[PDB]
Subunit: 203 residues, 4 copies
């Protein structure tokens, strides 16, 4: 009974992983397409003379901020779903290890588990990388927009100070969010490594 039920369970877990990959794909494509439309709309307003330079700079900052917030939200979701897939794979691993008790099978299942564990760590390293590049890049652009207005006299001192303060607040918030994503992820990876050690020692 267990071997077929485990096979069915394993196939469903793989289907779920495919669903997760599809959602991550849609998020990234949707993020990019919506961003493209926002950049094009701002470009049209600038070319049309539909907004003042200060208004355009603020809209560009709002765009960039929203872009990052969406990216961060997705990153938390993606890391959570992926780390959950790794934990779920460990539960699947244990169900199979407790059924097919052949040591040779257990070592191959454990080897596959280690490869997935490494891959997830690599995924988080990629996420941390893109976060840092995106925040650094968007921040430079935000500061450059404020400078452009200041150089041109497109905004009052209070308006410029507020843009600077609003930016710094968003920057700081992005850092808190990334901090939580990374921190939660590294703790989960260590827990998974400890679980992996016990399974290897037990087989």
């Amino acid at each position: 009974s267990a071997e077929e039920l485990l096979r069915r369970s394993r196939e469903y877990l793989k289907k779920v992983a495919l669903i997760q990959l599809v959602i991550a794909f849609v998020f990234l494509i949707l993020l990019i397409l919506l961003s493209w439309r926002s950049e094009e709309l701002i470009r049209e307003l600038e070319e049309k003379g539909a907004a003042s330079e200060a208004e355009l700079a603020r809209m560009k900052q709002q765009h960039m901020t929203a872009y990052l917030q969406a990216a961060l939200t997705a990153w938390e979701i993606i890391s959570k779903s992926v780390i959950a897939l790794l934990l779920l794979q460990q539960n699947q691993l244990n169900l199979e290890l407790n059924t097919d008790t052949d040591k040779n099978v257990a070592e191959e299942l454990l080897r596959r588990s280690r490869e997935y564990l490494k891959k997830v760590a690599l995924i988080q390293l990629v996420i941390a990388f893109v976060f840092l590049i995106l925040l650094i890049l968007l921040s430079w652009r935000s500061e450059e927009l404020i400078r452009e207005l200041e150089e041109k006299g497109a905004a009052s001192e209070a308006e410029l100070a507020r843009m600077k303060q609003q930016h710094m607040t968003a920057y700081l918030q992005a850092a808190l969010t990334a901090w939580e994503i990374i921190s939660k992820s590294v703790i989960a990876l260590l827990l998974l490594q400890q679980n992996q050690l016990n399974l290897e020692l037990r087989h």
Copy 2:
């Protein structure tokens, strides 16, 4: 003593589940009612000339946004409540399986649990469906409102670009929220399936 105590706990849980179904019903009716009242207020402002076309379109977008956010909040609560009930059913299942150890009772309890598990998965598929359809329809309405204002000249180009951008931001945020709800629900279902498999194999 244990059997009557288990009966009382079992009956209590059934009552809790029934209460939650009633609450979810009331929420949905209340959201529909309040949404309708808003639709009527906007309709009268439009017919009466109490607001400009741009003001009315913005209010319609605010209405749709709030509607969806309430629906998403309830969906998180509903999926959490329903999956929690399923977990509570498994907890009750184990209390009885480890008391009344008759395999035939265990089989009745396990078959009922398996059916409940399938039904919850179907519930989440329905919720995900409704979310996607609702966001698509609301998105279509939002774009049409903007198109109307732009063709009529009811709003400046900067105002229209902002509505388009604000819409896209809200659209993406709604998608992210739904994805988080769906993912957590699927993970919980996988964990429950793993628990169900162990219980069936162990009895």
Copy 3:
């Protein structure tokens, strides 16, 4: 060793519970005092003519909303704190029961736990009651304020519609918040009741 070490832990837990009762009391008082100050500030603005009728009605609504949100927040913390103390007592109880294994001691300890569990359920029922009454009363006042402005012509039709919409939104959000708090509390209590049953059956 454990009897004295547990004595110290038991004393600690009692001290923590007393501290939490005091803190919750202080927060209740702060909300009451802060609420008083706010109501008085609005009353004086009305008597002084420091704000228009529509603005005064809006401030009254903002006040009521903030009050309820604070009440809900405090309730969420209080129920989680009380439930955590209830869980901590079961954890402390298991440590004591497996040290002092005298059945007669276990019977007294189990009876005390059961009475506290019932008391906590009564506390949540009281909170749920208060929430429902409070939202209903605040809602009635909100509806009356909007109607007063409508009868007097204190606000444009679009402005009145916006107040009605903001009102309905806040109303529903409060209903959703209370639903989530109450349901989680009920779920936690049932899990504790199921755990209490196994512990009593084993002693």
Copy 4:
């Protein structure tokens, strides 16, 4: 084999603790530097006459609020990170205690565990202390800014009432947020102490 594997696992845990310490350090430096820039911008606006007295008071309040929120969030993250590390250390401790069962080794390891628990309790006491002092200071500064605007006639009665209400709200929210955080930390400290007891009783 187990001893070398345990050594590698311990080395990784040390690395993880270093990763979290570095991120928290950098975040706190960022918080401080951005706050300093904000303060300098406000100082220039005041000296330049770029904003009214009421506008400057509001900006100072917004600054203080944002700081407190970021600081409190960072503290929450830090306390959670430390507890997570302590839990990982306890798991690591059991991996070692279940391999090297020599009571003499266990006592030295248990002595370190007790020291780490005391150290986190001291960390939380410092955080709770700083939060309270900071809340008092910032609240004091806020009240004084409002008082001066009222005496100077820099704001209308309705504007001042709103500032007082916003002040009271921010105060209570910060206090409630800190309450939840601190209470959770205290609960975690007790749970860790309960684990410390069982670890000692078993060796």
